[PDB]
Amino acid sequence: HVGTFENITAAPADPILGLADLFRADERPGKVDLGVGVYKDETGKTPVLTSVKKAEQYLLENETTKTYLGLDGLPEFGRCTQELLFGKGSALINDKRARTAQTPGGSGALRVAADFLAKNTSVKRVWVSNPSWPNHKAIFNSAGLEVREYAYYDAENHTLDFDALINSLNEAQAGDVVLFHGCCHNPTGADPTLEQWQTLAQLSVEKGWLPLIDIAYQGFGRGLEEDAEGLRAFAAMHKELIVASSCSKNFGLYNERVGACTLVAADSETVDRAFGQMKAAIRANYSNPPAHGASVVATILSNDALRAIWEQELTDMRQRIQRMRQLFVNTLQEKGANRDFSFVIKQNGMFSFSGLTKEQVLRLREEFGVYAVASGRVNVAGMTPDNMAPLCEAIVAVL
Amino acid sequence: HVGTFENITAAPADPILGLADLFRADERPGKVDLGVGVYKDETGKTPVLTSVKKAEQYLLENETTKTYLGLDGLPEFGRCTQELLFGKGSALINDKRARTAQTPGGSGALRVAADFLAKNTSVKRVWVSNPSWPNHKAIFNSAGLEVREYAYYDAENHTLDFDALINSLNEAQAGDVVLFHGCCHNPTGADPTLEQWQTLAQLSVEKGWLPLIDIAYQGFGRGLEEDAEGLRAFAAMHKELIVASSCSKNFGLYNERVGACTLVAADSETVDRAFGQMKAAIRANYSNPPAHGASVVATILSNDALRAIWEQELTDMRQRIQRMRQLFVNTLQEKGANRDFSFVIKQNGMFSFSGLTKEQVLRLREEFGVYAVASGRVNVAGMTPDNMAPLCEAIVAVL
Numbered sequence A, B: 001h002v003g004t005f006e007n008i009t010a011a012p013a014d015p016i017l018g019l020a021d022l023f024r025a026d027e028r029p030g031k032v033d034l035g036v037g038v039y040k041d042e043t044g045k046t047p048v049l050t051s052v053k054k055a056e057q058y059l060l061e062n063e064t065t066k067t068y069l070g071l072d073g074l075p076e077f078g079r080c081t082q083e084l085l086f087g088k089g090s091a092l093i094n095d096k097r098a099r100t101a102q103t104p105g106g107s108g109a110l111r112v113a114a115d116f117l118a119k120n121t122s123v124k125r126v127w128v129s130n131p132s133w134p135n136h137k138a139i140f141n142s143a144g145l146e147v148r149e150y151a152y153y154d155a156e157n158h159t160l161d162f163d164a165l166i167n168s169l170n171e172a173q174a175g176d177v178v179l180f181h182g183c184c185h186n187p188t189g190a191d192p193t194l195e196q197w198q199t200l201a202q203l204s205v206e207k208g209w210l211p212l213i214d215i216a217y218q219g220f221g222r223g224l225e226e227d228a229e230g231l232r233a234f235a236a237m238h239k240e241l242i243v244a245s246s247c248s249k250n251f252g253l254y255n256e257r258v259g260a261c262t263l264v265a266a267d268s269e270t271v272d273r274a275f276g277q278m279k280a281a282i283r284a285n286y287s288n289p290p291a292h293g294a295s296v297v298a299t300i301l302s303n304d305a306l307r308a309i310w311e312q313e314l315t316d317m318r319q320r321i322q323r324m325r326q327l328f329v330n331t332l333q334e335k336g337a338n339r340d341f342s343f344v345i346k347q348n349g350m351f352s353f354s355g356l357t358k359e360q361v362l363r364l365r366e367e368f369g370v371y372a373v374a375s376g377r378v379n380v381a382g383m384t385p386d387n388m389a390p391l392c393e394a395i396v397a398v399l
Helices: A015-025 A050-062 A075-086 A105-120 A134-142 A162-171 A194-207 A229-237 A268-283 A291-301 A304-334 A342-346 A358-368 A388-398 B015-025 B050-062 B075-086 B105-120 B135-142 B162-171 B194-207 B229-237 B268-283 B291-301 B304-334 B358-368 B388-398
Strands: A098-103 A125-129 A146-150 A177-181 A210-215 A241-246 A259-264 A351-353 A377-379 B098-104 B125-130 B146-151 B177-181 B210-215 B241-246 B258-264 B351-353 B377-379
Touching: A050 A291, A050 A304, A050 B050, A075 A098, A075 A229, A075 A241, A075 A259, A075 A291, A098 A105, A098 A268, A105 A134, A105 A210, A105 A241, A105 A259, A105 A268, A125 A134, A134 A146, A134 B268, A146 A162, A162 A194, A194 A229, A210 A229, A229 A241, A259 A268, A268 B135, A291 A304, A291 B291, A304 A342, A304 A388, A358 A388, B050 B291, B050 B304, B075 B098, B075 B229, B075 B241, B075 B258, B075 B291, B098 B105, B098 B268, B105 B135, B105 B210, B105 B241, B105 B258, B105 B268, B125 B135, B135 B146, B146 B162, B162 B194, B194 B229, B210 B229, B229 B241, B258 B268, B258 B291, B291 B304, B304 B388, B358 B388
Parallel strands: A125 A146, A125 A177, A177 A210, A210 A241, B125 B146, B125 B177, B177 B210, B210 B241
Antiparallel strands: A098 A259, A241 A259, A351 A377, B098 B258, B241 B258, B351 B377
């Protein structure tokens, strides 16, 4: 009998992993990795937040069981998540129109949403932005859902081409899902203004789309509340929506897999009915979600002092990112960049498209030891006041 | 337009939660919960193990980042898992034939295995015992795989009807997956002898089944090494295996979602191809597995002192369960039970089928506050020296 695994085709090499290997083997002292996918501080570290360490100590000292939680996880974490998303006192929460399942990361939430939609609704198609966050397609396709892209970023002029966006969405049908990044669009950093969000929300009601908001950077754009404005504009106008939220970045809890899938429906009866089926989707997957990270988040958010420490940590991250954005632009100008990069200070979060070609990206790595991903996406948190001049000189040299 | 969620039909109520609800509302003091699905100690608690607390303290002190690891999780956890499953000096390990992805519990492992099989192999069918763990069907069905049942337990006579088992498996085709519980069959507690495992292993090679060993109770039957005998009998004889392992029960890490999916193939290059695609299945699901529980397990197993503590704790759990089995039988006899329950003494792990009718189970609950599941499955870890007499008196009264 031939082996069941004998003829499996190798998965394509991960170009990201390959760059990471090359980088760690690179012995040049001047090397700089702008391709990284997580936050880094000024020293190049991705530390455990102090608020998280404190919460973990509290759990160490107080947890008396690790017995299974329900399929939807820790109720307190669900409540905290809904408040972050919709605001405390939200009419939506008061009307009991939202149900939240804690999931292993926003990634887990996206897959749970995908499986739930596939098994219980007529949704066939999910629309995502161009450029897309690479992982959306794999997740939705895995559940049997088609993924299509709508117009979003004007790469030549470095803008969110809103008119192109709206027009391209005319192709989306009632009952399709349209996925928007809540804030800090990954990878462009180009977000709708509030007016644009309101226009999108109205359009979604007129066209009958089911909005899915992927929000993994609440707090990295302009602030916690500001960053939720778009989501809330949608929540105000829609009877239904899905939110896949993450605490990986804003709590620095990446590997603990802390996020949630929130369902909103027209009324309590409907959302409860839907949620029962979402729980079934969870039962057929990983059964119940990992407690530690969600416990940490609930612990931080349900304590005034810890929460304040965390909010400052988040503000510090946001502001370092903004500083690097401004310093990048100014240093490019100082180094004689032959064109303007002001778009960088108009963009939110750790990622922007540099506008560099793949050839320029290659040249940057080979000649200058400056690493970016093929798309030209750079993580400004990979920049520091000490590495900024040489990396900008390098960029100017390849323009 | 409206409601994508409006036409969703209600999930059937799950009687488990229903029974938990009933139990919770039951204010009677004599309550005995034999329906629970986790280990409980003599005081009726599901504690965090001391070895685990020590490991968590060490992590708090030493961890400096929670940045994403690979989709396969923590390498050291993978290695320790493999060593537990296959033993020191395993030729299989020496030949580099195994790869392990840390997953969110054995449940996550089973789903990942299912998705990996569905997307990359010709497996159409997974065979499970009658009865088996209730979630197997949902998990495999979710991935598009049919689930079929093989004969296993003779409920009238309280035996693993091995001849019935073997014959029923003649229907399993080459390339089908056949799932066996590694030890402490859930829910019967009836395990194959080593000779029976060897017979199954040989049959499996002859018939070309892909064995999937679901092992969630290693150490609860006869001991760590003994409980792996079955798995190892399969490993000795097979070019390919999948193991879904869990640390939920033997480390008391239930809600941290610590388990693994281990692929074994004919050789290193083959298992690498398979493993790459398993990683893709993970990427389309929850992406990274949750670090905390796996870090705990790796910390314990890679330290001689901590490991020795953990093994003693595991022995204590195993031995308590065995003592309750013995005590249950002796107490029923002394209480004049109108029949023999001696089958309970030889069964392995925390579960047995009591043989009580649903009428008797209902009466047990309504009249005596003794809670079993409708199937008559009892969790003997729900028994204690203190509750044993009234428990057995209630049972005698309903016989």
